């Protein structure tokens, strides 16, 4: 329906909003990222497309932190990703500033989803093009995972994948037993997934970034120590025949 | 806004048609069916049962955070249908309005005032040349101490009404016809009769078998005004008792 | 205007006195100096008679909104934080000493104090009011630990009745109310039911 | 409530021929007690300009922290360094910016002019600069100044010639005057911190003074 | 109008020690008897304050929020105690200039880069560092002993510093109107921040 | 504060006749600067107003009221009923309740349709009240109720009404330093307005 | 506290007493709608999230700029049901109604001041 | 040619999904002069190049000043360069006034990116056109952070964003081994040799077209110009070939 796809405040004869769907499609042409929750924790992983060797480790990262016990794995346009990370940081900061303790994951996810929806309602600002994951952990509630689509979706997923290589990742993740596992083998599973779905004719350099929060770290978000990452890297590399 | 209003007879909200019809709001009406759902709310004489439909796209998605039955006040519900990204905002707006009214007048709101406030704040979006009429179907539920249970429906245009039975979704026409046929036969009802009627209407409209865990039910009764959601056990028991 | 709270295992008790006045003349003989915010948390009052009402209304508004937003029962610490943030920000013309208490599903039984000035802190027993300075010794010397509902009610009745007679601001009926794990029950002590001393 | 309190101090400045000297005692005292005994009151601004700020020690810090920032702004903008002839006017403007809420300070500026020449300015709490040659001032003033008036610029003396001030004489005079004036005043004493400045940089100096 | 007593402190060979009384006075009555007055803002800086208590709560919340945000960001950098002292000084001065003063008086101590820091942040915009310090009414009684011992010996060890603080608590409890038997203490040595308490003070009234 | 100048006004309701009278004097405390200073304003035709108090606010309130009355008369078409001006002045005075004016107006007139006499009064900040027999307000308020209460009588013809309003003022206002030296009498019968000027002690 | 860094157009207003409030019900009456809106925005931002105040205030801005020119009375039919004062008649419209303004400025001057060009 | 209707503004998404204005600005930033950004263990040299309006006129300024421990370069539009360096200077001054420590680069660059992210969303505004090469050592070794027309900053070790520079990138990548242990003179020689590749054939580096600027351990950021740059530009071998 070309002709009405020029402003957010303009419908289509069929009924769809075309700018929103364009933003939906615009997140596909990026890298890939997955995230799984075990019995007592979560874990993520991103295929960081490393450019020429002029850069180094600690470059533009996609595993930000939002609080002492939450973190994201955003995969899309980086400027909007940083803006959203700052907004979520401010939200959690305000909640802890006056309500005590720390924000539950569901409330923060809902607030961020509503904020990212607020832009697609006006003819003054473009919608955000980016996917968004907000896995975290608790002490009594358990381990929770959420994904936020660019427009309004804020569903809760057991484990999903966002980015270009997404359909194959979903199909391969479908064949797991991620309801009675621990945080010492889901990491290896994630590594083998990210190496079983990775194109090589258009991608040349890879650098896996992993992070988990759970009972092994008693509720704290941080990058995996280099030893475990190297062991998972070796296992995944040797698993491909 | 430095982008202007697109020229055309149906490309913006503030331009009238040559015959005098708002085409943008008609597109908004057509937009509800895009998502694809069906919701039926029937009021008897002492109950206000609401039934809806739940669809899981896949297996990984959790089954506890996909509900389309929110709570507005302590004893008012909603069966929001359409695009989720706009119902998720209208629900918050209605909650804020209800809290403000309770603070300013000190008692629980009759359903009519909440419906009117939502309709007005939705209509105000259809005059300024900066807005988009967010597409939803604001169906209310609740009981009143002066007139009994009441069921109200609102539309993106802003035209609200009072219905003794309502169907909203992609199968509105045949469901409304079936409810019209059924209502004219008998007048008295009860909780079990209303629940069975709603389930039968949904099944005969969708023309499919209902799994024990596919439909959620929220009700309010005279004895228990508090808005409660039927658990899996009660829904399964009613479904297996149906047609037996 | 004597207000006090005591915490026991599984719940708390709460008493008050109904002799709101306007100086040397009695304004109202019997009142309800005990506001039921939400359904478990209870909030007494002291100081003036209008700023406290406004603060209570604002707290009811915000706490009800929060509870219905999270779809969970409220936590008393949230109410204490809200009272603190409301009172301290306006520490120029809001002379209203407040005491709140209630029960929650997690770590049930809480007694919080928030005197004039916006300071907030928790203590086992809270006492506040103009005529609430003559029973400090008695409550310190009598309050042991490990008491159930009945003796706690008796102790509160005795302790409040002691100041009920040695002051001009206090006098009249007594408004004991105990919040527990299950629900809220209220009773009034009038006439000879009030212990002598 | 009263947004003012005294903290003592003393500032003396000798502007010779090709040398400026700024010295000050070091003791933060309020009410009747003593807070510390180091509390330097002679801060450097550039390679050839030193500022001495007496008075209440709640604005003596704010003005010091603002002057350096404005100096950095000027250096970045005009691509130069402020001379001692402009800092006077700039500080006077800042001081007068709050004429209805005056700063409780008594500032003294010493430094070198465009050519090798002594120059010491002097302000007032409201803010009004005036060039001088040997001006002192501060809390324990009105005692430091008359002796300098007797010595530096020969006044009420007859049949005596005029000799320019030599560098060896300046420190010998300043130490003597501070030693003489420390006894009879209450707020002075403790350590004396000297900031003689010449056309090669800033060399510093510290001596004992009525040990307390 | 809850009020504190004294938040005195002395420097130390690799570390700082701060002591305070767990008391709250409602003018003259002793309304509260278990409140704390020592903070653990980060892994290398501690805090203590006197005067009003609500303002102490407010600055506690604000400063804890700032430090937790800085740590959460993540750059391998923290807040050295000098920066925190400067921030408190600026906040107090700005509040003073607006005719809304915070009736408070604080002590900031820490040990970073192999050196000790200790400062005074009086509400009128007063700031400095010293080998020893006292707050409130302790500026007349607590200071002289510490000053004398420090002038006799400029460097100490842990045992004599702890005993000196103990003696100062003894005399202050003897001869102050607002005081309590129990008191808190916390060292800031390079291992970390270790809050200790409550303590006790054995007295002797044999000259009665 | 109603002593920096002077003034006194009455109003009596007779038999289809209303009478309003004032006192002409304007002076700065003890001094006197003029003898002619109108305090009766012809709002409408068979209606009148009787501002009395501090003059510098009397002029301003009269101007504003005349402006608003012209606006309402022009917009709404026909004349103004006497009861409407009562609420008019009440609103105008309460406009500045916190910064109060200094006026105690008296309104007296006839209904253009019914010809039923009407008299009202006002306080400093606006508090409507209507008295059937008479009303009075001014600086010398105390020394007129006694003179008026006994001398009054119901159902009075215009001549007796004029005599009573003359006798209740001429020898009742001289018992005071300020607010003297001249009396204006306005009698408003059914068909024609009539104005008279009395003579009093020149002191 | 500003220096000069036409007096007939704006004159006869001493600097003495604008930095000296009048009867204490001055800052609570000159600025009332702004304060109420600020309080509501702060409450919503604290309890509901950062989206609501931004959205509502930018809606206010969008609806504000469609009224008539400043030198004529504004009906303000809209923005009222959205504000929430749809039926809250009070001491804002019956006392000194702006339609019957006692003093009125020049059209070009008022519109150019509303644009903020001056 | 299906792009005329989707590039006139910045708040519209193409059917493929990409903001065309961002790509156009990234192409625009390539108008200017090369600027190498080498770094070492103790010092971070920043060598640039200068054009010439005419033989009679004087050259432009390519190495500005920010503070005692940080100095930025410039490449692209010279209009927004000053408008952005003003914000640079103001933030650094505020951080020095409120606290009492130099503002670390890692927060300054994030703030600059956050500021530059705003114009790419609201209507009626255009993205900036700078190519900053912010350099400076504060507390944990010198850093070299790059900035793009889009608010997407990179960490780096050595790069030459600006004019024709791909050959400069190749040379800088070939010898990217010795830059970890060398003195100031060797690092400056390497920087000048890398820059010489950008300059066309049969052209040498004169005294009036280099703006070597050095910040390191115990020396504040100083800019060198005119005959003062001669001692660094002495050896340089004799010719690229």
From Swiss-Prot, chain B:
Compartment(s) of residence: Cytoplasm; Nucleus
Record-linked Gene3D superfamilies: Glutamine Phosphoribosylpyrophosphate, subunit 1, domain 1
Name of the gene: PSMA6
Glycosylated residues in this chain: 5
Modified positions (Phosphoserine) in chain numbering: 17, 63-64
Entry's family note: Belongs to the peptidase T1A family.
Subunit structure: The 26S proteasome consists of a 20S proteasome core and two 19S regulatory subunits. The 20S proteasome core is a barrel-shaped complex made of 28 subunits that are arranged in four stacked rings. The two outer rings are each formed by seven alpha subunits, and the two inner rings are formed by seven beta subunits. The proteolytic activity is exerted by three beta-subunits PSMB5, PSMB6 and PSMB7. Interacts with ALKBH4.
Protein name (record): Proteasome subunit alpha type-6
From Swiss-Prot, chain D:
Principal subcellular localization: cytoplasm
Modification Phosphotyrosine, positions: 121
InterPro entries membership: Ntn_hydrolases_N (IPR029055), Proteasome_bsu_CS (IPR016050), Proteasome_sua/b (IPR001353), Proteasome_suB-type (IPR023333)
Places the protein is found: Cytoplasm; Nucleus
Glycan attachment residues as annotated in the record: 29, 180
Record carries keyword Disulfide bond: no
Pfam families: Proteasome (PF00227)
Keyword field contains DNA damage: no
Gene Ontology biological-process entries: proteasome-mediated ubiquitin-dependent protein catabolic process; proteolysis involved in protein catabolic process
Effect of residue 74 to H: In NEDMHAL; uncertain significance; results in impaired proteasome assembly
Phosphoserine: modified positions: 33, 39, 133
Residues that bear N6-acetyllysine: 175
Domain of life: Eukaryota
GO cellular component terms, semicolon-separated: cytoplasm; cytosol; extracellular exosome; extracellular region; ficolin-1-rich granule lumen; nucleoplasm; nucleus; proteasome complex
Keywords: Acetylation, Cytoplasm, Deafness, Glycoprotein, Host-virus interaction, Intellectual disability, Nucleus, Phosphoprotein, Proteasome
CDD domains: proteasome_beta_type_1
Disease cited in the entry: Neurodevelopmental disorder with microcephaly, hypotonia, and absent language: An autosomal recessive disorder characterized by microcephaly, intellectual disability with absent speech, severe developmental delay, short stature, and hypotonia. Affected individuals also manifest aggressive behavior and have hearing loss.
Similarity comment text for this entry: Belongs to the peptidase T1B family.
Protein name per its UniProtKB record: Proteasome subunit beta type-1
Source organism (scientific name): Homo sapiens (Human)
From Swiss-Prot, chain E:
Induction text: Up-regulated in fibrolamellar carcinomas.
Record-listed Phosphotyrosine modification sites: 53
GO cellular component: ciliary basal body; cytoplasm; cytosol; extracellular exosome; mitochondrion; nucleoplasm; nucleus; proteasome complex
Swiss-Prot/TrEMBL keywords: Acetylation, Cytoplasm, Disease variant, Host-virus interaction, Nucleus, Phosphoprotein, Proteasome
Top-level taxon of the source organism: Eukaryota
GO MF term set: lipopolysaccharide binding
Similarity comment: family membership: Belongs to the peptidase T1B family.
Protein name, entry field: Proteasome subunit beta type-4
Source species of the chain: Homo sapiens
Organismal lineage: Eukaryota, Metazoa, Chordata, Craniata, Vertebrata
Gene behind the chain: PSMB4
UniProtKB/Swiss-Prot annotation, chain G:
Organism: Homo sapiens
Keywords carried by this UniProt record: Chaperone, Cytoplasm, Endoplasmic reticulum, Ichthyosis, Isopeptide bond, Membrane, Microsome, Nucleus, Palmoplantar keratoderma, Ubl conjugation
Compartments (UniProt record): Cytoplasm, Cytosol; Nucleus; Microsome membrane
Stored Pfam families: UMP1 (PF05348)
Record's subunit section: Constituent of preproteasomes, but not of mature 20S proteasomes. Within the preproteasome, may directly interact with PSMB1/beta6, PSMB4/beta7, PSMB5/beta5, PSMB6/beta1 and PSMB9/beta1i. Interaction with PSMB8/beta5i has been observed in PubMed:10973495, but not in PubMed:10926487. Forms tetramers.
Transmembrane segments: none
Gene: POMP
Name this polypeptide is given: Proteasome maturation protein
GO process annotations (BP): proteasome assembly
Tissues where the protein occurs: Strongly expressed from the basal layer to the granular layer of healthy epidermis, whereas in KLICK patients there is a gradual decrease of expression toward the granular layer.
Domain of life: Eukaryota
Motif (High-affinity association with the preproteasome): 45-49
Glycyl lysine isopeptide (Lys-Gly) (interchain with G-Cter in SUMO2) crosslink residues: 16
UniProt GO cellular component terms: cytoplasm; cytosol; endoplasmic reticulum; membrane; nuclear speck; nucleus
Keyword Cytoplasm: yes
């Amino acid at each position: 329906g070309t002709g009405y796809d020029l402003s957010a405040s303009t419908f289509s004869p069929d009924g769809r909003v075309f700018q929103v769907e364009y933003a939906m499609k615009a997140v596909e042409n990026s890298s890939t990222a997955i995230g799984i929750r075990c019995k007592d924790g979560v874990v993520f992983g991103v295929e960081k497309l490393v450019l020429s060797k002029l850069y180094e480790e600690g470059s533009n990262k996609r595993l930000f932190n939002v609080d002492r016990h939450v973190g994201m794995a955003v995969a899309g346009l980086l400027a909007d990703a940083r803006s959203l990370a700052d907004i979520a940081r401010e939200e959690a900061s305000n909640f802890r500033s006056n309500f005590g303790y720390n924000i539950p994951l569901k409330h923060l996810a809902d607030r961020v989803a509503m904020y990212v929806h607020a832009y697609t309602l006006y003819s003054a600002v473009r919608p955000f093009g980016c996917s968004f994951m907000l896995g975290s952990y608790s002490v009594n509630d358990g381990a929770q995972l959420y994904m936020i689509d660019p427009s309004g979706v804020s569903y809760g997923y057991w484990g999903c994948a966002i980015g270009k290589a997404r359909q194959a990742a979903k199909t391969e993740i479908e064949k797991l037993q991620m309801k009675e596992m621990t945080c010492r083998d889901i990491v290896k599973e994630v590594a083998k997934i990210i190496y079983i779905v990775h194109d090589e004719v258009k991608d040349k350099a890879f650098e896996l970034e992993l992070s988990w929060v759970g009972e092994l770290t008693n509720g704290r978000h941080e990058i995996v120590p280099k030893d475990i990452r190297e062991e998972a890297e070796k296992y995944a590399k040797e698993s491909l025949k | 806004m430095s982008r202007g209003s697109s020229a055309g007879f149906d490309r913006h909200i503030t331009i009238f048609s040559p015959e005098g019809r708002l085409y943008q709001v008609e597109y908004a009406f057509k937009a509800i069916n895009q998502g694809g759902l069906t919701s039926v709310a029937v009021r008897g004489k002492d109950c206000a049962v609401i039934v809806t439909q739940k669809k899981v796209p896949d297996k990984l998605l959790d089954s506890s955070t996909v509900t389309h039955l929110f709570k507005i006040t302590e004893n008012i519900g909603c069966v929001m249908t359409g695009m989720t990204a706009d119902s998720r905002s209208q629900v918050q707006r209605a909650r804020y309005e209800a809290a403000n009214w309770k603070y300013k007048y000190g008692y629980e709101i009759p359903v009519d005032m909440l419906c009117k406030r939502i309709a007005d704040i939705s209509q105000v979006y259809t005059q300024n040349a900066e807005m988009r009429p967010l597409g939803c179907c604001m169906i209310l539920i609740g009981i009143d101490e002066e007139q009994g249970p009441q069921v109200y429906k609102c539309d993106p245009a802003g035209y609200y009404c009072g219905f003794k039975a309502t169907a909203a979704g992609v199968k509105q026409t045949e469901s409304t016809s079936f409810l019209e046929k059924k209502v004219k036969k008998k007048f008295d009802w009860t909780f079990e009769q209303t629940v069975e009627t709603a389930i039968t209407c949904l099944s005969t409209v969708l023309s499919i078998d209902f799994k024990p865990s596919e439909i959620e039910v929220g009700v309010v009764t005279v004895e228990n005004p508090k808005f409660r959601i039927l658990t899996e056990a009660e829904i399964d028991a009613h479904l297996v008792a149906l047609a037996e | 205007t004597t207000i006090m709270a005591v915490q026991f295992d599984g719940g708390v008790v709460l008493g008050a006195d109904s002799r709101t006045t306007t100086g040397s003349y009695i304004a109202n003989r019997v009142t309800d100096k005990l506001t039921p915010i939400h359904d478990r948390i209870f909030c007494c009052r002291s100081g003036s008679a209008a700023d406290t009402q406004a603060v209570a209304d604002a707290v009811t508004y915000q706490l009800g909104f929060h509870s219905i937003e999270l779809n969970e029962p409220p936590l008393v610490h949230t109410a204490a934080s809200l009272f603190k943030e409301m009172c301290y920000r306006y520490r120029e013309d809001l002379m209203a000493g407040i005491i709140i208490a209630g029960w929650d599903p997690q770590e049930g039984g809480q007694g919080y104090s928030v005197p004039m000035g916006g300071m907030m802190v928790r203590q086992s027993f809270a006492i506040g009011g103009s005529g609430s300075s003559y029973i400090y010794g008695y409550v310190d010397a009598t309050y042991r630990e490990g008491m159930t509902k009945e003796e706690c009610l008796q102790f509160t009745a005795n302790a409040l009745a002691l100041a009920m007679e040695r002051d001009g601001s206090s006098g009249g009926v007594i408004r004991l109310a105990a919040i527990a794990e299950s629900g809220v029950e209220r009773q009034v002590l009038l006439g000879d039911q009030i212990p002598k001393f | 409530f009263s947004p003012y309190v005294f903290n003592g101090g003393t500032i003396l400045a000798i502007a010779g021929e090709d040398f400026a000297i700024v010295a000050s005692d070091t003791r933060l005292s309020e009410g009747f007690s003593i807070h510390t005994r180091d509390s330097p009151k002679c801060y450097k601004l550039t390679d050839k300009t030193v500022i001495g700020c007496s008075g209440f020690h709640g604005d003596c810090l704010t003005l010091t922290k603002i002057i350096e920032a404005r100096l950095k702004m000027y250096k970045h903008s005009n691509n130069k360094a402020m001379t001692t002839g402009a800092i006077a006017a700039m500080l006077s403007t800042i001081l007068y910016s709050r004429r209805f809420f005056p700063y409780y300070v008594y500032n003294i500026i010493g430094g070198l002019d465009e050519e090798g020449k002594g120059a010491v300015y002097s302000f007032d709490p409201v803010g009004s600069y005036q060039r001088d040659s040997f001006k002192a001032g501060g809390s324990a003033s009105a005692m430091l100044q008359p002796l300098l008036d007797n010595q530096v610029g020969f006044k009420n003396m007859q049949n005596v010639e005029h000799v320019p001030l030599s560098l060896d004489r300046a420190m010998r005079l300043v130490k003597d005057v501070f030693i003489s004036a420390a006894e009879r005043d209450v707020y002075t004493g403790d350590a004396l911190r000297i900031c003689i400045v010449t056309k090669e940089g800033i060399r510093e100096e510290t001596v004992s003074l009525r040990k307390d | 109008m809850v009020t504190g007593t004294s938040v005195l402190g002395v420097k130390f060979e690799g570390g700082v020690v701060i002591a305070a009384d767990m008391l709250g006075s409602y003018g003259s009555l002793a309304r509260f008897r278990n409140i704390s007055r020592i903070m653990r803002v980060n892994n290398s800086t501690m805090l203590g304050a006197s005067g009003d208590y609500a303002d102490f709560q407010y600055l506690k919340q604000v400063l804890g929020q700032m430090v937790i945000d800085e740590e959460l960001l993540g750059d391998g950098h923290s807040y050295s105690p000098r920066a925190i002292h400067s921030w408190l000084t600026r906040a107090m001065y700005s509040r003073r200039s607006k005719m809304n003063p915070l009736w408070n008086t604080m002590v900031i101590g820490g040990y970073a880069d192999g050196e000790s820091f200790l400062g005074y942040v009086d509400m009128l915009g007063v700031a400095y560092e010293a080998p020893s310090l006292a707050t409130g009414y302790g500026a007349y009684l607590a200071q002289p002993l510490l000053r004398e011992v420090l002038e006799k010996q400029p460097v100490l060890s842990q045992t004599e510093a702890r005993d000196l603080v103990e003696r100062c608590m003894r005399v202050l409890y003897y001869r102050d109107a607002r005081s309590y038997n129990r008191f808190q203490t916390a060292t800031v040595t390079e291992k970390g921040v270790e809050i200790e308490g409550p303590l006790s003070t054995e007295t002797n009234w044999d000259i009665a | 504060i109603m002593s920096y100048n002077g003034g006194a006004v009455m109003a009596m309701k007779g038999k289809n006749c209303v009478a309003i009278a004032a006192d002409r004097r304007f002076g700065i405390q003890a001094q006197m600067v003029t003898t002619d200073f109108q305090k009766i304003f012809p709002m409408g035709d068979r209606l009148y107003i009787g501002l009395a108090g501090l003059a510098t606010d009397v002029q301003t309130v009269a101007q504003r009221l005349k402006f608003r009355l012209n606006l309402y008369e022009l917009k709404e078409g026909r004349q103004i009923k006497p009861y409407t001006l009562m609420s008019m002045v009440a609103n105008l005075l309460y406009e500045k309740r916190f910064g109060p004016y200094y006026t105690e107006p008296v309104i007296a007139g006839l209904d253009p349709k019914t010809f039923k006499p009407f008299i009202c009064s006002l306080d400093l900040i606006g508090c409507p009240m209507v008295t059937d027999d008479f009303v009075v307000s001014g600086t010398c308020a105390e020394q007129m109720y006694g003179m008026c209460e006994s001398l009054w009588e119901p159902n009075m013809d215009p001549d007796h009404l004029f005599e009573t309003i003359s006798q209740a003022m001429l020898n009742a206002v001289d018992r005071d330093a300020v607010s003297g030296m001249g009396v204006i009498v306005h009698i408003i019968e059914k068909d024609k307005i009539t104005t008279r000027t009395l003579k009093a002690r020149m002191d | 506290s500003p220096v000069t860094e036409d007096l007939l157009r704006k004159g006869f207003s001493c600097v003495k007493n604008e930095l000296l409030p009048s009867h204490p019900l001055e800052l609570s009456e000159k600025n009332f709608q702004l304060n109420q809106d600020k309080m509501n925005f702060s409450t919503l931002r604290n309890i509901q999230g950062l989206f609501a105040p931004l959205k509502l205030q930018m809606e206010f801005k969008a609806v504000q700029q469609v009224q008539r020119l400043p030198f004529l009375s504004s009906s303000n039919l809209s923005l009222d049901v959205l504000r929430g004062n749809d039926e809250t008649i009070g001491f804002e419209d019956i006392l000194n109604d702006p339609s019957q303004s006692e003093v009125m400025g020049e059209p070009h001057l008022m519109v150019e001041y509303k644009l903020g060009l001056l | 040619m299906f792009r005329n209707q989707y590039d006139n503004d910045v708040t519209v998404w193409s059917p493929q999904g990409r903001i065309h204005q961002i790509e156009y600005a990234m192409e625009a930033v390539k108008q200017g002069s090369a600027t190498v950004g080498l770094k070492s263990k103790t010092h971070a040299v920043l060598v640039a190049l200068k054009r010439a309006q005419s033989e009679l006129a004087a050259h432009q300024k390519k190495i500005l000043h920010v503070d005692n421990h940080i100095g930025i370069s410039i490449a692209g539009l010279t209009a927004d360069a000053r408008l952005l360096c003003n914000f640079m200077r103001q933030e650094c001054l505020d951080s020095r006034f409120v606290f009492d420590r130099p503002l670390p680069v890692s927060r300054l660059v994030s703030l600059i990116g956050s500021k530059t992210q705003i114009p790419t969303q609201r209507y009626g505004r255009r993205p900036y056109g700078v190519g900053l090469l912010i350099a400076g050592y504060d507390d944990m070794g010198p850093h070299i952070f790059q900035t793009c027309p889009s608010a997407n900053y990179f960490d780096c070790r050595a790069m030459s964003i600006g004019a024709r520079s791909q050959s400069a990138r190749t040379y800088l990548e070939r010898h990217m081994s010795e830059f970890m242990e060398c003195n100031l003179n060797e690092l400056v020689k390497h920087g000048l040799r890398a820059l010489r590749e950008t300059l066309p054939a049969e052209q040498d580096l004169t005294t009036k077209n280099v703006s070597i600027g050095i910040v390191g351990k115990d020396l504040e950021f100083t800019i060198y110009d005119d005959d003062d740059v001669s001692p660094f530009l002495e050896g340089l071998e004799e010719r690229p070939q």
